[PDB]
């Protein structure tokens, strides 16, 4: 059904912003529920947080809400992460999928995830 | 948070064995219960839903159950594509979280 | 300009915000006699300052 894609990966300089877009082919964002995950290699998979498709509400991590920005762009059918501050603490993996939950089918698409780096 | 507690954390096992890995939640989720497969290298993959209902395109060796705060995810017969990690997650109570995954390696 | 100091020494100090297509180093000039750049080549990193 949906298909995922991550923008390319690379570098963050510590204490600046990490900026990710995710865009979505073959399916529309006018529906459910759009989401970043994050994994730190070798590591478990931490929900980041999701906007609401149809209404464009967010929710975030408690651990992450200081820092994390998320949108949706109607114009280019895609979806972004903004993380303020970054430090080699947020090095990972960064997935997007339909993610917290959908009104008929959620988190079925996982993106297949972009290298992050932190470095100086 | 809705902490989810995954058991075992690692598991060696061989092709052709029975392998159950259990998921606790901190509070009751009814049967709203996720199980994911992940690769080195890869993203993770949609194996059941809602406790109990297999993903299309996923073998019928992976089964699901439970409901409250107790959930299982059964591989009845473990197949050499099978040797991976797994994740519970539940979308439930602010937030939705992942369980801190079950690495299974061949013995 | 973060600064500028009209002077004969290399007094004038430019910031360029940049967003690379890939990391490595490149050349930097000024097609006019007003302004010597004291560097020939500048190193960059993805998106940053130099």
């Known amino acids: 059904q949906v298909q995922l894609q991550e923008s390319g990966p690379g570098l963050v300089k510590p204490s600046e912003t990490l900026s990710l877009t995710c865009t979505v082919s073959?399916?529309?964002?006018?529906?459910?529920?759009w989401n970043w995950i994050r994994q730190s290699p070798g590591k478990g998979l931490e929900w980041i947080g999701n906007?609401?498709?149809?209404?464009?509400?967010?929710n975030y991590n408690p651990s992450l809400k200081s820092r994390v920005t998320l949108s949706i762009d109607t114009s280019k059918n895609q979806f972004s992460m903004k993380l303020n501050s970054v430090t080699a603490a947020d090095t990972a993996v960064y997935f997007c999928?339909?993610?917290?939950?959908?009104?008929?089918?959620?988190?079925?698409?996982w993106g297949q995830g972009v290298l992050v780096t932190v470095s100086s | 948070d809705i902490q989810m507690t995954q058991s075992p954390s690692s598991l060696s096992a061989s092709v052709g064995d029975t392998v159950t890995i259990t998921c606790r939640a901190s509070?009751?989720?009814?049967?709203?219960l996720a199980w994911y497969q992940q690769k080195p290298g890869k993203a993770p993959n949609l194996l059941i839903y809602?406790?109990?209902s297999l993903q299309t395109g996923v073998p019928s060796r992976f089964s699901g159950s439970g409901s409250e705060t107790h959930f299982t995810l059964t591989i009845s017969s473990l197949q050499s594509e099978d040797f991976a990690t797994y994740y519970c997650?539940?979308?439930?109570?602010?937030?939705?979280?992942f369980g801190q995954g079950t690495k299974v390696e061949i013995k | 300009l973060n600064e500028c100091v009209y002077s004969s020494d290399f007094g004038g100090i430019a910031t360029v915000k940049y967003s690379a297509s890939k990391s490595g180093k490149c050349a930097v000039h000024v097609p006019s006699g007003t302004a010597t750049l004291k560097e020939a080549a500048v190193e960059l990193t993805e998106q940053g300052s130099a």
């Open positions: 999928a339909s993610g917290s939950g959908d009104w008929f089918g959620y988190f079925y698409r």
């Open positions: 073959g399916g529309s964002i006018s529906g459910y529920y």
């Open positions: 906007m609401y498709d149809s209404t464009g509400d967010t």
């Open positions: 509070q009751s989720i009814s049967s709203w």
């Open positions: 809602k406790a109990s």
């Open positions: 997650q539940q979308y439930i109570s602010r937030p939705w979280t």
